[PDB]
């Protein structure tokens, strides 16, 4: 069993915890309880190989913004999450991308761009704009709903494949 250290990052309220708990427990969390730092483990077979995912669920609130280096050092791959109905969270993505690159001192960190809350009709970030950003980073873009499970396994397991091929 190979172990993979995944880290979920992004602005406050975009659904990082809801995405993670949907993956881990098949349950959608309605409450908005801001995270400080949580960790989860999941044994899962991906492309025929069993592995153990360690998932770090991080704080999006700006009051925690000085505490990120410590978890970026340990992570092997990063889900970079914004919400498709919150333009500011999309604009916050590049700050996370740049900090990860600085901390890991690398241009080539496994990442996936995730546009969450795709169950909501009132979209303000168009898929094309997010896809353009993902291409500029060399990473895939996956739209997800923590509420319906759409795309959730695809987002996390695509990140595992990126770490595996790194």
């Amino acid at each position: 069993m190979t172990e993979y250290k995944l880290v979920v990052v992004g602005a406050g309220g975009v659904g990082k915890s809801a995405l993670t708990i949907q993956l881990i427990q098949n349950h959608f969390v309605d409450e908005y309880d801001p995270t400080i730092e949580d960790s989860y483990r999941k044994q899962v077979v991906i492309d025929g190989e069993t592995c153990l995912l360690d998932i770090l669920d991080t704080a999006g609130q700006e009051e925690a913004s000085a505490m990120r280096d410590q978890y970026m050092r340990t992570g092997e791959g990063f889900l970079c999450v914004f919400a498709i109905n919150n333009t500011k969270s999309f604009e916050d993505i590049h700050q996370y991308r740049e900090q990860i690159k600085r901390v890991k001192d690398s241009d080539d960190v496994p990442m996936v761009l995730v546009g969450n809350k795709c169950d909501l009709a009132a979209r303000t970030v168009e898929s094309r704009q997010a896809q353009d950003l993902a291409r500029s980073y060399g990473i895939p873009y996956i739209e997800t709903s923590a509420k319906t499970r759409q795309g959730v396994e695809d987002a996390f397991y695509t990140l595992v494949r990126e770490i595996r091929q790194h």
Partner: protein, 469 residues
């Protein structure tokens, strides 16, 4: 340079690390042993978060610190003094200017705010995942509510208000799949006809599915509080480990029911059909990764009353002999193949709990509570980490739910199964063994013949599922 710290005389968590208060294992450090003060410092360390350490500590701390004392210590940890103005600040103030307060601002940003936030994360995890401390001590809960409810200042405000709401919700306290569960399967017994339910009249696929839902729910209900301190082995086990004991007693009852179904079927041909059906149920348990169920069957087949039934074994089809033998091989060599199989499958699964119990008990019994170093007694934290590695593995397999539909009547049938009746254990297991001797006497006594007891067809419907439109 490093930030200066408060004097250790006014703030105890600023004492320097030494081998008299903390020992590390041989990129964050791993703690082998330390004083409770040093453990709490590292639990809430300003340089890094350690969520695994938070879980380990909150799972195991009661073996070295009382809940009331832990809360006092983390409140003490939270109340960090701010440094006085520096010489440059003093000179600015003496000239009527605003000081830069560079050292103060750095200490707030890089020491106080991370430590305080990590104290609140301990509180949040304590309330969310270890709430039994507060259920068992109402005054502890009052103290936590007051502490959280009186934290001032904007930096912590979002988490303080959130934790207040979480506590209130915990005081008064839904699954989604993308695929549909398979259709419930029926055999001789039809829906609603619970009086005809039995080993051979329910569908073997559905017996295995409903037992797996039941056993999964029992597995998922066991909390670490029932395990730490080996409390399920002690005099108060019924008070401290009720979900674990309910799970084990279900397993025992199902094993005895299988044995009873076999030895009370006196006709050889019918008993072969009974054993063959039980091995089919075992095959579905294997397909579902219900290892508890697999071992329930294996334990029944290896019991003294069943194992000796050579005439029955002889007539079991070769492919079923092989299924049973390979299932038994999982337990050989101290569960070597079971452990490898558990770590390779795709959950959901239902682990066998017994291995975890033995490993927790032996870790607790085989390691000292304290390490003596330089005249000091340090808490042996490595021992607690080992226990929490086991409880963490247990919890990891409790997350994934089965995509199977409950059948309420079949569920009730297996919940109410009571093969022993009003008999005590020794009386009942002697009865089973005496039935075994009756139906297949010891050589050289001749094998008797017995009349059939089942009026319905013995042919199995098999264990491959069906799918109408």
């Amino acid at each position: 340079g490093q930030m200066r710290l408060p004097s250790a005389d006014v703030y105890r968590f600023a004492e320097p690390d030494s081998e008299e208060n903390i020992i590390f294992e041989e990129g964050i450090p791993i703690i082998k042993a330390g004083t409770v003060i040093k453990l709490i410092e590292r639990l809430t360390y300003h340089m890094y978060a350690d969520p695994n350490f938070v879980r380990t500590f909150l799972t195991t701390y009661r073996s070295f610190c009382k809940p009331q004392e832990l809360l006092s210590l983390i409140i003490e940890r939270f109340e960090i003094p701010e440094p006085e103005p520096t010489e440059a600040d003093r000179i600015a103030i003496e000239n009527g200017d605003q000081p830069l307060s560079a050292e103060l601002k750095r200490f707030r940003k890089e020491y106080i705010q991370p430590v305080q936030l990590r104290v609140l994360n301990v509180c949040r995890h304590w309330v969310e995942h270890h709430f039994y401390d507060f259920e068992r001590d109402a005054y502890l809960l009052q103290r936590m509510e007051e502490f959280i409810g009186t934290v001032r200042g904007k930096a912590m405000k979002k988490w303080v208000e959130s934790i207040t709401k979480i506590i209130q919700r915990k005081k008064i306290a839904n699954i989604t799949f993308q695929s549909s569960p398979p259709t419930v399967e029926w055999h001789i017994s039809r829906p609603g006809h619970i009086e005809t339910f039995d080993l051979l009249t329910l569908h073997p696929i559905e017996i295995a599915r409903q037992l797996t839902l039941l056993e999964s729910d029992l597995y998922r209900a066991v909390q670490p509080s029932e395990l730490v301190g080996s409390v399920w082995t002690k005099e108060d086990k019924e008070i401290n480990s009720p979900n674990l004991l309910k799970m084990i007693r279900h397993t025992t009852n199902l094993t005895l029911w299988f044995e009873k179904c076999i030895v009370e079927t006196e006709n050889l041909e019918e008993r072969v059909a009974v054993v063959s059906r039980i091995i089919e149920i075992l095959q579905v348990f294997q397909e579902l990764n219900n290892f508890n169920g697999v071992l329930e069957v294996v334990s029944a087949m290896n019991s003294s009353p069943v194992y000796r039934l050579d005439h029955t074994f002889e007539q079991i089809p070769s492919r079923q002999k092989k299924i049973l033998e390979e299932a038994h091989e999982l337990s050989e060599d101290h569960y070597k193949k079971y452990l490898a199989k558990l770590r390779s499958i795709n959950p959901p699964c239902v682990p066998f709990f017994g291995i975890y119990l033995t490993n927790i008990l032996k870790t607790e019994e085989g390691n000292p509570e304290v390490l003596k170093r330089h005249g000091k007694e340090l808490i042996n934290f490595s021992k607690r980490r080992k226990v929490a590695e086991i409880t963490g593995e247990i919890q990891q397999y409790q997350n994934q739910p089965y995509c199977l539909r409950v059948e309420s009547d079949i569920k009730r049938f297996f919940e109410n199964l009571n093969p022993m009746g009003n008999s005590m254990e020794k009386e009942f297991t002697d009865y089973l063994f005496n039935k075994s001797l009756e139906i297949e006497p010891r050589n050289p006594k001749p094998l008797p013949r017995f009349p059939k007891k089942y009026s319905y067809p013995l042919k199995s419907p098999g264990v491959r599922p069906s799918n109408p439109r």
